Amino acid sequence: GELVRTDSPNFLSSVLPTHWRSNKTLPIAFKVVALGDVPDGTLVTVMAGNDENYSAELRNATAAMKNQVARFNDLRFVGRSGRGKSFTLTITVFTNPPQVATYHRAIKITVDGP
Ligand SMILES: [Cl-]
Ligand SMILES: [Cl-]
């Protein structure tokens, strides 16, 4: 239930692993929390990428706000960052107009995981 800051003062998130196995269910369901006043049903997506891969494959990367929290049911990281690299996670909140926030830490995704 721990929340951390994103690089936007309007959004917090739950905590993800620093390194996880490709396609494996996460230990803690991902959440995005609005501090500002965001309407129920507001869509939220996550995208992962790096210099070698603009949008790595994910699963279940869309959620909807309910009472200022968007809970991703089973977000999974499919694409591998693999070799000496990691991914930056961008959160897009579909208010009008949309807002972006970056998850605070890079995430490494490998076939074996930690
Ligand atoms: Cl990919
Ligand atoms: Cl790998």
Domains along the chain?
Answer: 1-114 (2.60.40.720)
Binding site annotation covers 2?
no
- How close is the Cα of 80 to the center of ligand 1, in Å? 6
Experimental method: X-ray
Binding site annotation covers 111?
yes
Closest CA to 35 of 106, 93, 88: 93
- The DSSP symbol for 17 reads P
Dist CA 98 CA 91 (whole Å):
10
The set of long-range contacts for 4-10, using a CB threshold of 8 Å and a minimum separation of 24, is: 4/104, 5/104, 6/91, 6/101, 6/102, 6/103, 6/104, 7/101, 7/102, 7/104, 8/99, 8/100, 8/101, 8/102, 9/35, 10/34, 10/35, 10/36, 10/99, 10/101
Ligand located closest to 77 CA: 1
Per-residue 3-state assignment (H helix, E strand, C coil) for 28-41: CCCEEEECCCCCCC
| Resolution, expressed in angstroms to one decimal | 1.7
Residues 6+ away with beta carbon under 8 Å from 24 = 76, 113
Q: Are 110 and 82 in contact (CB under 8 A)?
A: yes
